């Protein structure tokens, strides 16, 4: 049941991205927002999002920022928490320039390329002129909540998300019979079976590899 665990993992991953896409695409049509943006006052924008999130938490993106062309109008400010220079968002804007589709992008951040999944929705005016684009993103590095979600949803023993040989995040606690290092340089299919699943983003192959460790139940 290898391909089964792998597809399970992929559906769980697909599920999370879906939760965000839907929430994004809806906020992108929230007159309250559109008008708070055209109003040109960062407060309603801040408040708008703080309220948006006040109850849909954990289903909230890690990064969020509105922008018209290269002119970033508003930013939730979480970019800095990730060690991402307001500058490094402008380059991501061009990189993700194809609305309604998720993009796996990298970005420099204090000596470690940070891997992010991004997507943009256009903010139209109730007049029909596009007024900007809302950019939403999920940071993969150290995103334990995302990996833990997928681990329990698939009832996996442990999981580790790596950009091959290099771990982005793990569920291991440090008491397992196996080390993170082992899990990462281990053969695909032993006492501890180690599965390997390359995630697809929008049905497209990706270098994101999720390792699933299952203990040989024989034992």
Quote the CA–CA distance of 48 and 30 in Å, as a whole number: 10
- Contact between 162 and 143 under an 8 Å Cβ cutoff? The reply is no
d(CA 171, CA 166): 15
Query: Is the same domain home to 127 and 30?
Result: yes
Cβ proximity of 141 and 190 under 8 Å: no
The CA-atom distances, in angstroms, between 47 and each of 12, 33, 153 are 31, 10, 33
Resolution to 1 decimal place, in Å: 2.8
Element (H, E) at 3: helix 2-27
Give CA–CA dist 34/55, Å, rounded. Answer: 21
Boundary of a domain, candidates 140, 155, 170: 155
Determine the Cα–Cα distance for residues 140 and 116; give it in Å rounded to an integer: 6
Same domain, 174 and 120: no
Side-chain half-sphere exposure of 106, counting CA atoms within 13 A? 10
CATH number of the domain enclosing 212:
2.20.20.100
Looking at the structure, do residues 114 and 30 belong to the same domain, yes or no? yes
Do 141 and 176 belong to one domain? no
Max Cα–Cα distance, the chain, nearest Å: 67
- State phi, psi for 208 to the nearest 5 degrees: -75, 115
- Is there a contact between 116 and 138 (Cβ–Cβ < 8 Å)? yes
CB distance 61 to 157 below 8 Å: no
Task: Locate the DSSP E strands across 4-113.
Answer: 63-68, 71-75, 103-107
Domain boundary among 137, 155, 173: 155
- For tokens 């995302």, the residue is 146
Give the Cβ contact number of residue 60 at 10 Å.
19
Q: What is the three-class DSSP state of 48? A: helix
Instruction: Answer yes or no: do 43 and 139 share one domain.
Output: yes
Q: Do both 38 and 28 map to the same domain?
A: yes
Q: Classify residue 78 by burial, with Cβ atoms within 10 Å: 0-12, 13-18, 19+.
A: middle
Give the range of the structural domain holding residue 208, as residue numbers without chain letter: 156-219
Whether residues 24 and 67 share a domain: the answer is yes
Question: What is the signed CA dihedral for 16, 17, 21, 23, rounded to 10 degrees?
Answer: 20
CB 141 within 8 A of CB 188: no
C-alpha angle 82/64/35, rounded to 5°? 150
What is the spatial distance between Cα 58 and Cα 177, in angstroms, rounded to a whole number? 31
In this structure, the answer to whether residues 160 and 134 fall within a common structural domain is no
Q: Are residues 189 and 146 in the same domain?
A: no
Tell whether 21 and 73 lie within a shared domain: yes
Nearest to 125 by CA among 12, 14, 28: 28
Residue among 166, 138, 150, 164 at smallest CA distance from 212: 150
State phi, psi for 115 to the nearest 5 degrees: -95, 125
3-state secondary structure of 165: coil
Residue with tokens 């993170």: 180
CA distances 124 to 25, 179, 216, Å, are: 11, 50, 54
Which among 138, 155, 172 is the end of a domain?
A: 155
**Ramachandran bin of 45, using left for φ above 0, alpha for ψ from -120 to 50, beta for the remaining angles:** alpha
Same domain, yes or no: 143 and 166: no
93 and 21 within one domain? yes
Number of domains in the chain: 2
Residue 129 CB neighbour total at 10 angstroms: 6
End-to-end CA distance of the chain: 18
- In this structure, what DSSP letter does residue 113 have? P
* Experimental technique used to determine this entry: X-ray
Dihedral sign computed on CA atoms, order 179, 185, 188, 191: negative
């Amino acid at each position: 049941t290898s391909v089964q665990t792998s597809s399970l993992i992929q559906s769980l991953f697909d599920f999370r991205l879906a939760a965000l896409r839907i929430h994004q695409d809806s906020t992108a049509k929230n007159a309250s927002l559109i008008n708070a943006l055209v109003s040109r006052d960062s407060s309603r924008l801040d408040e708008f999002f703080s309220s948006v999130d006040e109850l849909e938490l954990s289903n909230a993106p890690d990064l969020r920022f509105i922008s018209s062309h290269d002119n970033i109008l508003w930013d939730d400010g979480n970019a800095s928490f990730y060690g991402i220079a307001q500058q490094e968002l402008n380059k991501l804007i061009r990189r993700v320039a194809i609305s309604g589709n998720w993009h796996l992008v990298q970005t420099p951040s204090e000596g470690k390329s940070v891997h992010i999944l991004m997507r943009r929705s256009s903010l139209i005016e109730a007049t029909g002129q596009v007024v900007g684009y809302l950019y939403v993103g999920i940071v993969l590095n150290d995103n334990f909540a995302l990996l833990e979600n997928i681990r329990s949803g698939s009832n996996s023993e442990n999981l580790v998300l790596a950009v091959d040989t290099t771990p982005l995040v793990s569920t291991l606690k440090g008491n397992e019979p196996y080390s993170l290092d082992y899990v990462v340089h281990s053969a695909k299919d032993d006492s501890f079976i180690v599965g390997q699943t390359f995630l697809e983003v929008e049905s497209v192959p990706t270098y994101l590899c999720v390792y699933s460790i299952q203990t040989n139940q024989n034992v």
